[PDB]
Amino acid sequence: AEYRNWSKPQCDITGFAPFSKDNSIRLSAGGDIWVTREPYVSCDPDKCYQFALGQGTTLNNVHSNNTVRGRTPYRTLLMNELGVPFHLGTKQVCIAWSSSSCHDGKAWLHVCITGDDKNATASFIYNGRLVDSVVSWSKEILRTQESECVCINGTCTVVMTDGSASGKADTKILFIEEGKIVHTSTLSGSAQHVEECSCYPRYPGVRCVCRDNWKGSNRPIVDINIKDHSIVSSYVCSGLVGDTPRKNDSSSSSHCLDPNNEEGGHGVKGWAFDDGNDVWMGRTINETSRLGYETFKVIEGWSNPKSKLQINRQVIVDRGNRSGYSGIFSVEGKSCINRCFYVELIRGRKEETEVLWTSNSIVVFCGTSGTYGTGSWPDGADLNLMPI
Amino acid sequence: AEYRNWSKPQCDITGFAPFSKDNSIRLSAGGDIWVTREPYVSCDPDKCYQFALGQGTTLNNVHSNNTVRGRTPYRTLLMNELGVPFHLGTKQVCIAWSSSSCHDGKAWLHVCITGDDKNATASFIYNGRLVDSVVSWSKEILRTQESECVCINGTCTVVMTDGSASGKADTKILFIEEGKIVHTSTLSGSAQHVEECSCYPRYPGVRCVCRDNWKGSNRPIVDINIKDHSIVSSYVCSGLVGDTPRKNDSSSSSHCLDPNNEEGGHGVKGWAFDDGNDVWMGRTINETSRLGYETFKVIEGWSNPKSKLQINRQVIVDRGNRSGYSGIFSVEGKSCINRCFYVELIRGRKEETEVLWTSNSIVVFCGTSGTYGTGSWPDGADLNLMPI
Amino acid sequence: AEYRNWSKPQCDITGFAPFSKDNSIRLSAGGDIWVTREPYVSCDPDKCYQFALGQGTTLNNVHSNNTVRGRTPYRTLLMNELGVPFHLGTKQVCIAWSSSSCHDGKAWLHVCITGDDKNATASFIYNGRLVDSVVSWSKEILRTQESECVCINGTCTVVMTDGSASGKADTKILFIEEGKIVHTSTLSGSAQHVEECSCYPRYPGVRCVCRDNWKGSNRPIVDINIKDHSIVSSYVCSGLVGDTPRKNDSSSSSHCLDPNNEEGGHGVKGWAFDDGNDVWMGRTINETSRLGYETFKVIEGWSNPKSKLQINRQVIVDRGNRSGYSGIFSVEGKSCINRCFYVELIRGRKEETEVLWTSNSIVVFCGTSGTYGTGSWPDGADLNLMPI
Amino acid sequence: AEYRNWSKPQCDITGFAPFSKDNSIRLSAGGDIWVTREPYVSCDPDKCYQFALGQGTTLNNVHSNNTVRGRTPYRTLLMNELGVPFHLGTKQVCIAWSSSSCHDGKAWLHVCITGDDKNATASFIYNGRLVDSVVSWSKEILRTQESECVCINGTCTVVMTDGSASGKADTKILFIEEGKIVHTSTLSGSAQHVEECSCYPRYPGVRCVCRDNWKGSNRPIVDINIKDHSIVSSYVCSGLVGDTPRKNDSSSSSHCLDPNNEEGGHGVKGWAFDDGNDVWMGRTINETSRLGYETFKVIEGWSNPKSKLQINRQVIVDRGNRSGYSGIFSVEGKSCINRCFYVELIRGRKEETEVLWTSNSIVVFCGTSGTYGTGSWPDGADLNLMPI
């Protein structure tokens, strides 16, 4: 077994093809399925896994009341092969209400944060054993990616944040080798608020498209040099913006250096990646709610902050149906590196009051250089008929 | 690890012996089993797997209401080792209301079709990753085999159809190397309507026996040259015919080149294979309805369209009991290649009104050169008593 | 991987130590567990498996009514690692209402019998594929061991009976190499009625202790020479006899060549093995019904029919609890071959009328050269409190 | 594969970081989960496993009534990968109402005790087969560690006690090679009563920290030489004592050689380990009953019986939440050996009257040389809402 270095060019991409769907909420009306949220996907050299943060409870269960709450001591990072729903034989790989995982070519790394809001601990679990940990540095909800980290030649990188949800905060980027934190760089550059980065290998470095919860409905970019540990940052230029909330298609604008100040407060986890000067991105369909999900290529959208010219739109989830978090993962092909993404499909409280719980299922697509059609793949559970 | 070539002679066959049975509906009356249809069987070099299209629901579940509908966003391809029923830890391997799978000797190929009726997408998954996709070419329900594809020297072959269920349609044969469509040939020869092919290796080529939903109750044959990508097609000569519906034994007839025009409308997925100039085949016992299942050898049935001489009949499922789709799969022995088949046992709507759902179980038999007796191995569930 | 020769002396045995218990009926009052009967145990070179004939239903399931019936089309052979109860993820390895299994050191052999009473088929499955099959020869309930077969240098042997349950019958010993029946020898010697053999390796051959359902409450012995395929047979000499029913300890007698003719009608699967000229054996404690279970050594019991001298008694299940079938299996140690045994703990109809079903659990013990104590390990379910 | 030697120094430890949590009871309110007690953790060279003593029943089950009882014939040792909850697919590796397990680098050893109180049997299973067994020597509840044993260069060691719970008893240390008891040493030195040892490797030997149920609220220590089989014993010097019950922080005292005589009767399994002259130790937070759990380091606590100087306190479970047993295991890093511990969270009878069963879940922490914060990780089940 060798270390991955992702030392191949990015595949041609013309759009995305369907890859996986777990139907978790529909199955939970007739079986024992975990309540989850904040799911993500990552793969070893042979095959993909789905992760999510459980709630220490199944759906048809009295302990699913009040599961809208994000941080409890019962929350654990769940791990199955992709397309195995989170049944009772699912492995909890650590204690976590915020997490990140990745495989370096030899073994798995997980970064798992739990404990008090004002004094959380991050544990670093590698090849099936604890190897390091850090405390919260700013004592305000230490939190990480909720998607995969990236590893090159044995060095893995992970973005972490501690501090305000609506003001300046303290973002750091960790470099980790066989579970050991070997370096800590601090966030530098134009990015003013950074959370829940979706990162990908872009040899010889790593790149991340994050969420700005403060003043931006445009999305922060973070660039990580894995050899000298240097960091630069900025925003996704595209006139069509990735966050939710945001302004509409006509009213919106963006900027390659600063946040845009356009209904910037709050946000959602999302993704984007470069293809020459064009940008591939996904976002919720609805501008102010987590309803629907779409992807498109914005022509000249990676370098020109005026560009509003999209092409190759696909509806993933129609605008009448719930979506949520989304993020990227990368898959090594024969000659190239592919990009794929997953979409969290949130159901229940507080937006849906027919049930006392909050949970999600997932749908997953992958880059293709071939051709594709249209459809819509929502959660599809009927909450009027769920547990009593 | 080497590619499969299937370059051994077909094994001597005197009939078929019991191999496997899943008892799925019976178990679902007291456990969490998937609602499914369109099952099949395929084996890696070491062992067999059972596949089926799920409905995104378990049976004892509110969402099983109306599972008679065949194409929904929630349909996924299920995959287990043969004999493990589709319980809640079953892996969904891709999004699909139509699919086909094969192992090339090194890894699994899956072909999965989902999306809108008039603009569906076929995904090609090899060795656990998306490698290609193709759009619907005629915008009328792109669909494929619902049984195993066939690989020789690392080239896998799949038959896909797009277009009318009751008229000329566009059928294509794809050639896939490590998930990648390297060539597309179009249907040629005298077969007029081709659907749901049961294919098998017949060195140095591949051979398929299909369903004609239009004018034929004899079954079409497609022959695939794997090296120069040429196609030829025709029909199974045999005067005892394989489709359902069809005419009775005294009234039926056939033709080696054209559809017989006898009760041709509609059909069922089925199988056949040659033995010198004889044919081994299976079919439902009833002519008009999907009731019972039987196999036999028709003497000179592969070359003589007037032969009605069967020997070695076995009853697999008795005629008072429901059957369904069936198809072929090939298993390599020490000196020779064997032939086996599965039979879908459909239960529930719309034919049975005791329940609101539609699902199946399966029974599987394999070629033998030994001896055997008689029995009947139906589904055996009691719908009068099932959940509610 | 190499074939097993079992070419090692038998380990020293002073008695038996507890090895495994699955609590299957106790667990089924609060979970989805298979209904079974006729369990057994066999091990590959690394680990042990539990097998049983399923009834195609779980316990808390309407289909469990009338599971007292021994032969239906829904019965399949279940296979789990020893100590994993038969839950929903359990593999049905073949269709069977009678079976035998063994590993030759390279792969598993399964001998599976299903079909009509008067025309049954025995399937032979080796390394995940059907290699052979044979018809019922006397057209009267073709039946086999219901415990492990034995393989030496790649030739496996198995005992099958077709014919009357209370008269002369046709018993055969088959020689199987990689699933292929290579030779068939017919029963010879003085054994008069032979059923359900518990066989074990005794280099350079195989020995079996079987059930006489006709005239003997002593048990038959069969010696198999694996090289010339010759067969000899007699009975277990011991004055304390192993079948149930039987006469009490003061009234009973035996014969080394003939059935004792003492309450010889009916029987139960049991086991014995030779230690020098003494015999280890188990049996039900109650002489007329399947209640309690016990093991002991009979001094000179293998070579003298007048000996009633037992030493080293162990109670496995106390005389107030239900027992059932029992059989042997052999485990290869560093320097020697150990002998172990399992016991079927039958619950339900007809003997108990508080429930409608009939199932079992199991308890397993192994040979030891060390020391041990006392106890009783019954089924332990409260039928008073089980599902209506 | 080579034998583990543990021939590396103990890692730097600044405290403990969160590792695993199973949420067992919370999940049992809406799924099929085993009732358990006396759990522990042990790892093979790749990964960790969780173990427990099942009550031969699930929680939502009539047979869960009165599971407060500690010894029945239905209790078995359960084994899953760490963080996979005890669902119905869980392996019962042996019959045991007391046990210990360990991996010698090549295969697993399990030591399992079952049978009559006055004549129990201990079985020794290695590489999936029974290799030896020994009887109760003093005919009074033969019992062992309830935590991992320790193996060096292929010699494994385990502590067993037989005799009174409130008087002198007979404690022995067994040396086991590939399952074979090769030597038996009797307890020697100044420790007066010894139960449930938490043992760890300390090259070239093994150290244990145990429970004195007779006259000490300070914990016994046992040192074990693996080459000459010698044994020395004493107590944990620390003026802050680890047993429950015990006297308060201000009133307590200890001694390096003899039991302190302070609320000595009864006890709780627990752990400690040495760091130079310091001791790392955990204990329940309440002095009298099993509530809360804490860890700290005592300065000079290992070698000075007067020190009451603690530092580096962590609450693991808060004072208002039930705790229970706890123990140590050890994990091999690149350069050093880490120490981890688990905590049993008991719920139900007799302390909690709302339900009829008695069961538990677990939380698990590992030594870290990095930094960490605060929190509390209780069981989290609401018993008033549990299956009544």
Ligand SMILES: *[C@@H]1O[C@H](CO)[C@@H](O[C@@H]2O[C@H](CO)[C@@H](O[C@@H]3O[C@H](CO[C@H]4O[C@H](CO)[C@@H](O)[C@H](O)[C@@H]4O)[C@@H](O)[C@H](O[C@H]4O[C@H](CO)[C@@H](O)[C@H](O)[C@@H]4O)[C@@H]3O)[C@H](O)[C@H]2NC(C)=O)[C@H](O)[C@H]1NC(C)=O
């Ligand atoms: C079968 O499936 C395929 C694949 O999904 C569909 O083809 C896609 O259709 C979509 C939607 O129309 C296309 O995305 C759109 O591209 C527009 C560009 O227009 C032209 O651009 C150049 C020339 O300027 C040409 O090359 C090109 O052919 C177009 O003529 C964008 O302007 C669109 O954005 C706007 O429309 C959407 C609504 O659709 C709004 O919501 C946006 O806000 C915005 O106003 C859009 O991005 C996509 O590129 C096509 N893909 C491919 C690969 O060809 C078929 O439509 C589908 N068929 C059926 C019958 O369903």
Ligand SMILES: *[C@@H]1O[C@H](CO)[C@@H](O[C@@H]2O[C@H](CO)[C@@H](O[C@@H]3O[C@H](CO[C@H]4O[C@H](CO)[C@@H](O)[C@H](O)[C@@H]4O)[C@@H](O)[C@H](O[C@H]4O[C@H](CO)[C@@H](O)[C@H](O)[C@@H]4O)[C@@H]3O)[C@H](O)[C@H]2NC(C)=O)[C@H](O)[C@H]1NC(C)=O
């Ligand atoms: C135990 O199990 C075995 C194996 O299944 C059974 O043997 C088979 O029995 C079937 C049914 O009779 C046989 O199939 C039939 O073959 C006929 C062939 O004609 C004769 O010619 C041969 C060769 O010359 C002779 O050996 C023999 O006399 C044959 O009879 C066909 O004519 C039959 O087709 C017609 O009958 C069926 C109804 O049975 C109709 O539905 C058809 O439409 C058609 O009119 C039929 O195909 C089979 O070949 C036998 N197999 C073998 C391997 O021997 C035993 O019968 C069974 N015993 C019991 C008691 O159950």
Ligand SMILES: *[C@@H]1O[C@H](CO)[C@@H](O[C@@H]2O[C@H](CO)[C@@H](O[C@@H]3O[C@H](CO[C@H]4O[C@H](CO)[C@@H](O)[C@H](O)[C@@H]4O)[C@@H](O)[C@H](O[C@H]4O[C@H](CO)[C@@H](O)[C@H](O)[C@@H]4O)[C@@H]3O)[C@H](O)[C@H]2NC(C)=O)[C@H](O)[C@H]1NC(C)=O
């Ligand atoms: C974020 O997370 C960290 C890590 O968990 C917390 O820091 C730990 O806090 C505990 C408790 O405050 C510390 O442990 C305590 O150590 C005391 C001695 O340390 C002080 O004094 C010595 C010598 O005099 C100095 O060298 C040293 O620097 C300290 O100033 C003990 O006295 C304590 O025991 C006593 O208090 C406890 C209650 O805490 C009682 O229950 C005992 O019975 C006893 O009376 C205690 O053991 C621990 O060392 C700290 N860890 C680290 C790594 O610093 C932070 O508190 C937390 N932040 C927030 C905001 O909550």
Ligand SMILES: *[C@@H]1O[C@H](CO)[C@@H](O[C@@H]2O[C@H](CO)[C@@H](O[C@@H]3O[C@H](CO)[C@@H](O)[C@H](O[C@H]4O[C@H](CO)[C@@H](O)[C@H](O)[C@@H]4O)[C@@H]3O)[C@H](O)[C@H]2NC(C)=O)[C@H](O)[C@H]1NC(C)=O
């Ligand atoms: C603790 O456990 C040990 C080991 O199990 C146990 O020792 C065993 O006790 C039995 C019962 O006495 C011994 O077996 C007997 O052997 C004598 C010959 O010496 C036989 O005559 C006995 O058979 C007669 O009695 C039986 C009733 O027990 C009748 O059922 C039978 O029909 C005969 O009439 C019997 O086989 C056995 O040899 C020892 N085993 C060893 C290894 O020593 C010990 O007794 C237990 N201690 C306690 C306090 O329970």
Ligand SMILES: CC(=O)N[C@@H]1[C@@H](O)[C@H](O[C@@H]2O[C@H](CO)[C@H](O)[C@H](O[C@]3(C(=O)O)C[C@H](O)[C@@H](NC(C)=O)[C@H]([C@H](O)[C@H](O)CO)O3)[C@H]2O)[C@@H](CO)O[C@H]1O
């Ligand atoms: C009692 C009450 O009503 N309190 C609300 C509280 O619910 C609410 O918090 C937000 O609630 C929504 C549910 O609609 C989500 O749960 C938010 O969580 C997420 C998000 O989806 O955006 C999920 C994620 O788990 C969070 N990460 C962590 C580590 O907690 C992120 C995270 O908070 C953001 O990235 C900012 O740091 O948010 C959750 O925030 C708030 C409104 O925000 O209001 C209270 O009054």
Ligand SMILES: CC(=O)N[C@@H]1[C@@H](O[C@@H]2O[C@H](CO)[C@H](O)[C@H](O[C@]3(C(=O)O)C[C@H](O)[C@@H](NC(C)=O)[C@H]([C@H](O)[C@H](O)CO)O3)[C@H]2O)[C@H](O)[C@@H](CO)O[C@H]1O
């Ligand atoms: C019905 C009744 O009242 N029984 C009493 C006995 O029960 C004891 O109850 C306590 C809790 O209150 C514990 O469960 C005792 O079990 C443990 C323990 O301390 O947790 C549980 C372990 O499984 C057990 N190990 C074995 C092998 O049995 C262990 C041992 O008993 C001791 O370590 C041996 O010294 O303790 C449970 O026994 C109680 O035994 C008795 C007082 O001793 O009082 C009874 O009335």
Ligand SMILES: *[C@@H]1O[C@H](CO[C@@H]2O[C@@H](C)[C@@H](O)[C@@H](O)[C@@H]2O)[C@@H](O[C@@H]2O[C@H](CO)[C@@H](O)[C@H](O)[C@H]2NC(C)=O)[C@H](O)[C@H]1NC(C)=O
């Ligand atoms: C089972 O379903 C029927 C049919 O419902 C439709 O088809 C399904 C695929 C599902 O997705 C439904 O939403 C569709 O409406 C139900 O009968 C219909 O119910 C609706 C709403 O109550 C009503 O307006 C229509 O009249 C009904 N349609 C027909 C053809 O009868 C029915 O309620 C379901 N059965 C149960 C027990 O829930």
Ligand SMILES: CC(=O)N[C@H]1[C@H]([C@H](O)[C@H](O)CO)O[C@@](O[C@@H]2[C@@H](O)[C@H](O)O[C@H](CO)[C@@H]2O)(C(=O)O)C[C@@H]1O
């Ligand atoms: C293959 C088969 O049916 N095996 C039976 C076995 C045989 O009947 C016997 O060895 C043949 O002589 O015996 C057992 O089953 C019994 C039935 O045969 C009997 O008719 O009814 C009994 C009702 O309690 C009982 O079920 C047996 O002795 O337990 C079982 C086995 O499946």
Ligand SMILES: CC(=O)N[C@H]1[C@H]([C@H](O)[C@H](O)CO)O[C@@](O)(C(=O)O)C[C@@H]1O
């Ligand atoms: C993709 C798809 O819908 N396939 C369906 C086919 C096609 O309709 C026919 O081959 C005609 O096109 O027919 C069925 O309902 C059937 O006969 O049982 C089931 C199956 O789901």
Ligand SMILES: *[C@@H]1O[C@H](CO)[C@@H](O)[C@H](O)[C@H]1NC(C)=O
């Ligand atoms: C978008 O919404 C805002 C409302 O504040 C408004 O400026 C603008 O008219 C809207 N644009 C369109 C196209 O409706």
Ligand SMILES: *[C@@H]1O[C@H](CO)[C@@H](O)[C@H](O)[C@H]1NC(C)=O
């Ligand atoms: C977005 O979602 C809200 C929530 O129901 C809806 O009312 C609103 O009209 C939607 N807006 C658009 C433009 O679809």
Ligand SMILES: *[C@@H]1O[C@H](CO)[C@@H](O)[C@H](O)[C@H]1NC(C)=O
């Ligand atoms: C076959 O069907 C025709 C009706 O079209 C009928 O005349 C004939 O009797 C049928 N044959 C049999 C054997 O039922």
Ligand SMILES: *[C@@H]1O[C@H](CO)[C@@H](O)[C@H](O)[C@H]1NC(C)=O
């Ligand atoms: C400790 O316990 C004793 C019990 O007699 C008591 O006198 C003392 O006050 C207690 N001290 C504290 C600090 O609780």
Ligand SMILES: *[C@@H]1O[C@H](CO)[C@@H](O)[C@H](O)[C@H]1NC(C)=O
């Ligand atoms: C220990 O537990 C009991 C439970 O009733 C409680 O009353 C007592 O106060 C606790 N001890 C301390 C020091 O709080």
Ligand SMILES: [Ca+2]
């Ligand atoms: Ca249930």
Ligand SMILES: [Ca+2]
């Ligand atoms: Ca924002």
